[PDB]
Amino acid sequence: MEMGRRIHLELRNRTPSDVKELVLDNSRSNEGKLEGLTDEFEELEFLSTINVGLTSIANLPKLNKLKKLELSDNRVSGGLEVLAEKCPNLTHLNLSGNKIKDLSTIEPLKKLENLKSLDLFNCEVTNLNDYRENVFKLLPQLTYLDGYDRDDKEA
Amino acid sequence: ANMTEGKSKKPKTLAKECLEKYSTLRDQTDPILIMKSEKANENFLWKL
Amino acid sequence: MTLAKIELLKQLLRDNEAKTVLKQTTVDQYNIIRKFNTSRIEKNPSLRMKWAMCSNFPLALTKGDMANRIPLEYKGIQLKTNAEDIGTKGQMCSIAAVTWWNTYGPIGDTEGFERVYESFFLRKMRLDNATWGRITFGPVERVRKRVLLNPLTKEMPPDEASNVIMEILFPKEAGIPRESTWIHRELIKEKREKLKGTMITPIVLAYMLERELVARRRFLPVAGATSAEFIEMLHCLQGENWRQIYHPGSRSQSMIVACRKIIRRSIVASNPLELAVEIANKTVIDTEPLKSCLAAIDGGDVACDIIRAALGLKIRQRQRFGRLELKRISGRGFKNDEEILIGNGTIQKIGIWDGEEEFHVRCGECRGILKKSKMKLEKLLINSAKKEDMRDLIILCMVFSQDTRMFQGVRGEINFLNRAGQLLSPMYQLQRYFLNRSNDLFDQWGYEESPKASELHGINESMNASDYTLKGVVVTRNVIDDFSSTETEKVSITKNLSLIKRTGEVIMGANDVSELESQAQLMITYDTPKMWEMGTTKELVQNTYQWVLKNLVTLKAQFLLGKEDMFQWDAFEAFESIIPQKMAGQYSGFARAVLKQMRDQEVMKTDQFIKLLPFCFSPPKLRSNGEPYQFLKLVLKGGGENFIEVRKGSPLFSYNPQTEVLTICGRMMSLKGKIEDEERNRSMGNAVLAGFLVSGKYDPDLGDFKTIEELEKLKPGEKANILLYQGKPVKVVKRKRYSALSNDISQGIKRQRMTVESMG
Amino acid sequence: SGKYDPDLGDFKTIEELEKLKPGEKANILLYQGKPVKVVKRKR
C-alpha cells in the first residue's frame, strides 16, 4: 500500500477539490515524506498522518482553510516554522508519540497565533521540570494542551 | 482516583471500591504481555 | 500411477476370484477383508532382529527411483541388490545404505518439523524451561487416581477425533459434515494451515493428530499436582521415599458458573429439561458451544453432570448427595417412608433406608469408607487431607446416614429454600442447616475413645488431629483408594433435571448443586434473551454486542432493505432495561436518524453500525419541530464508566481501524476487516462439503463428477454430481444459508409447548 | 431539581461539574447520607 492508493480510495478518482479531509495512515513513504498530495489542493479541514515514518516537514500544499492536523508515531525532529508559511490557520496540533529532543524544537510555533491545542505525549521534551509552565509562557496563543489547561473538553 | 467524603476505611474496602469504579481493569483475564524479566515467569505472576 | 492403478486393477480382475469378491463385498465389509492376513507373527522379535541385522540385505526397500542415487556397492561395500522380492515385491538393502543416506544424498525440507510434530517440541519446551528445586527424601503419601498422561490441545471423544482428523487431512470423502466440525472449526483451520506445505505420508500425520487430540488416561499413584504437565514428568517428580520440586515451563470455573446459572434458570420454570438443553447448546465460551469443555473433562461438578445428562454425554455414575460422591460397595437399602420426630420437636414423614449398606465416600480431597445401618451410622474411615474437606465429609456423611442422633441434634428451624425460591425435601434442608451450623450435631453426637492402634488415630470436633474422637469416626494413617469400575452405566434424565438409574432409583437430584456464585473468568456469551436478564449492565452490553456480531450477515442483509422490522428484535429488549427510561427514546430517535443517513448518503461502516443499532429498540421522541435530537455520549445505567462514545470509542466499546480490531467490555476480538470478504474469512474454517446439501441420486445428466474447487464455481441453487465418502455417487445442491439443527429442534419444541399451553 | 437517582450514576466531582454544559443534570453529596440532584442553569 502507498500514499497514492489511499488518495485514490478517499477521492474515489474525483476532482481534488471534493474532500476537506484526508486519512494517510499506515502508508509507507519515500525517505519519510508525505508525497501523493499535490499542491493543487485548495480546500482541506482535517488531516491524519500516523505510522507514516515522516522525518521532516518540507512538502505540504499551501492552504488557508485547514484547522486540524494529526502527526503521531514518527521520528520527525526539525523546525516547524514552515507551517506558518504553508498554513498559518492551525487550531488543533497533535505530535503525540513524535521524537523531539529539547524545547527549541517547539519554539517556531510562536509566530502562529491561531493554534489553541497542542498534544505532546511520551516525548523526550515532556520529561522536564516546569515543561508545562515553560511551554505555556513560550506559546501565549495556546489555549489548550495535552488536556489539562484548566478543565477537560473534547475536540 | 475515587473521590470520597473523607471517612477512614480499611485498605481492602478501598481497593475493592477503586476496582469497582474501574471495573474493566478488574475483569481483565487475557493479558497482553509487553515485556518480560530475564528469570521471572510471566504466567505465574499473572495468575498471582 | 493412475494408469498403473487401472492396469493393476484389470490384471487383478482377470482372475475370477477377484471379480466375485469385489462384486460381492460392499464397501463397509472391506474391513473384514483386510483382517484376513496370515498372522504368522514372529515368535521372538529379539532373535529375529539379531539374525536380520547380520544378514547381507535385511532391509526391505520399496521399488522406486531412489535407489539410483546410491550404487549397488559403494567403496567396496554392498548396499542394495536388484534381485526380485515376493514378500513386498520391492528390492533388498542393508543398513549401510541407510547410514550413507544419513551421511550423503538428497537434502530435504526442514519446515515441516516446526509444526507437524508440535506436541513433541512442546514437550521439549516444557522440559527445558522447567525449574527444579530441592529433594524431600521423607516418605510421600500417594493416591491412585485417573490421570491424563499427556496434555491435549482440545480433548474430544474418539469418534469426533477421527471425524476431525478426516476433515483436516482428507479433503475428499467428507460427506455431510456432522454437528462436530462447526464446534472445532478453529482447530480445523489451524491444523489445516499448519500442516499445509508438507510431504509426509498422511497416515503419520493422522496418528500424530490422534495422539494430539484423543485423550489417554490411566490409574497412577500421584501426590500433589495432577495436570498432564506434571504427569509427563511423574517418573522423576514422584518417588516412594523421595519427592522433587518441579514447575513446568481458567475455562473450568467459567463452565461451572455457566452450568449453575443454567440449572437455576431452568429449574424455576416448568419442564426444566428442554429449556436447560436449549440454553446449554445455545451457549458459547469465546469460540465454541458448551459441548467443547464439558465433553473434555471427565465428570466434574454436579451441575455439569446434570447438564451433560441433559445433553448427550457420558457422566460417571457416582451418587452425588450435596457434595458427597458415594459409590455403593454392597448391601441393598429398602427406601420406606417413616414418620420421625426431629430434635426441634416437629415430626416429619421422610424416606429411610432399612438394611445395612456401605459406600466409598469422597468430598474434595477427602476419601473414606462409610458403613451404615438403618437409622444409624456404624463406621467411618478417613485419611487426613484437609480440615475443611474433612469437616464437610463428616457432616455430609452424618446427614446422609440419617442417624437418629443427627435428628435429635437439631436446634433451630428448617424452612429454607434455594436462590430460585423453592421448598426442598427435609434431607437437603437438614444438610443446609447442619452445614450452616456445623457445631450443632457435633456437640451432642457423643465421643468415643481414641482408636488405640499402630496407625489408627482419632480426630476431635474441631478437625484437629486430636484424640478423643467422635463416635465411629476414625482416621487411618494410610491411603484409601476407591471408586473403581467407573462403568458410566446407562442413566436416564427426568424433565426436572434429576437423574435416575436404569431402574427408578434417583442418583442425582436437581437440588444437589450448591448455591454459590462466582465470576466467569471468560466471556459467557449466550444466544437466548431469557438467560441474560440477571447480571450487571456491562454483561448485558457485552452479550448484546456478541449477539449482534455472531449473526452479522442477517442484520447486514436486512439493513439494505431499510425496514423497521430489523430494529424490533427481542435481543435488544433486555438492552432496553439498561437505558434510562427518561432518555432512551431520544437515543432511539438519534440512532435511527444516524443510521438512515448512513444508508442514504454514505457506504458500509460496520463499527458505527454495530455501535448505534441496539439503542433503537425503544420508540423515538423527535424534537417539537420534528428533527431528531443529537448526542455524542450515550449514558448507561450505573453512570461513570457505563457510557458509550458515538465518535471513536469508550471503555465498553472501542474499534481501532489501523489494525481493524474490536474491544468490547475489555475484550479484544478480531474484525479482520469488513465486507463479505471478511465474512468468508470467518468461514475459512468450517468443513469441506459444508455449503452443499444432498438431493437425488447419481443423475448422469451432468456427465463426470467435479472437484470441490470446481464445485465452488457453481452458483447457489445449482445441481452437481459428486462422490460421497468412498464412492457413492450422489447429486448435491449448493446451500444458500448456514444451518443449525439444534436451533431448529429448540424452536420446534418451543412451538409445541406453546400449542400445548394454549390448548390447556 | 430532584433526589438521589442511582441510575444517573454516582456523585460527580467538581472536575466534572466545572466542565458540564447547560441543561445537563448531575448528582452531588452534601454530607454522609444526604445526597441531592442538581441541574446547571444559564443564569
From Swiss-Prot, chain A:
Tissue specificity comment: Expressed in all tissues tested. Highly expressed in kidney and skeletal muscle, moderate levels of expression in brain, placenta and pancreas, and weakly expressed in lung. Found in all regions of the brain examined (amygdala, caudate nucleus, corpus callosum, hippocampus and thalamus), with highest levels in amygdala.
Positions annotated as LRR repeat: 18-38, 43-64, 65-87, 89-110
Modified residues (Phosphoserine): 17
GO biological process per UniProt: intracellular signal transduction; nucleocytoplasmic transport; regulation of apoptotic process
Tagged with keyword Transcription regulation: yes
Gene Ontology CC, one term: nucleoplasm
Compartments reported by the entry: Nucleus; Cytoplasm; Endoplasmic reticulum
Modification after translation (UniProt): Phosphorylated on serine residues, at least in part by casein kinase 2/CK2. The N-terminus is blocked.
Keyword Phosphoprotein: yes
Molecular function GO labels: histone binding; RNA binding
Chief location of this protein within or outside the cell: nucleus
Domain (LRRCT): residue spans on this chain: 123-155
Post-translational modification Phosphothreonine, affected residues: 15
Keywords in alphabetical order: Cytoplasm, Endoplasmic reticulum, Host-virus interaction, Leucine-rich repeat, Nucleus, Phosphoprotein, Repeat, Repressor, Transcription, Transcription regulation
Basic and acidic residues compositional bias, start-end: 147-155
Complexes and interactors: Component of the SET complex, composed of at least ANP32A, APEX1, HMGB2, NME1, SET and TREX1. Directly interacts with SET. Interacts with ATXN1/SCA1. Interacts with MAP1B. Interacts with ELAVL1. Part of the INHAT (inhibitor of histone acetyltransferases) complex. Interacts with E4F1.
Function comment: Multifunctional protein that is involved in the regulation of many processes including tumor suppression, apoptosis, cell cycle progression or transcription. Promotes apoptosis by favouring the activation of caspase-9/CASP9 and allowing apoptosome formation. In addition, plays a role in the modulation of histone acetylation and transcription as part of the INHAT (inhibitor of histone acetyltransferases) complex. Inhibits the histone-acetyltranferase activity of EP300/CREBBP (CREB-binding protein) and EP300/CREBBP-associated factor by histone masking.
Family: Belongs to the ANP32 family.
Protein name, as recorded: Acidic leucine-rich nuclear phosphoprotein 32 family member A
Covered range of the whole protein: 1 to 155 of 249
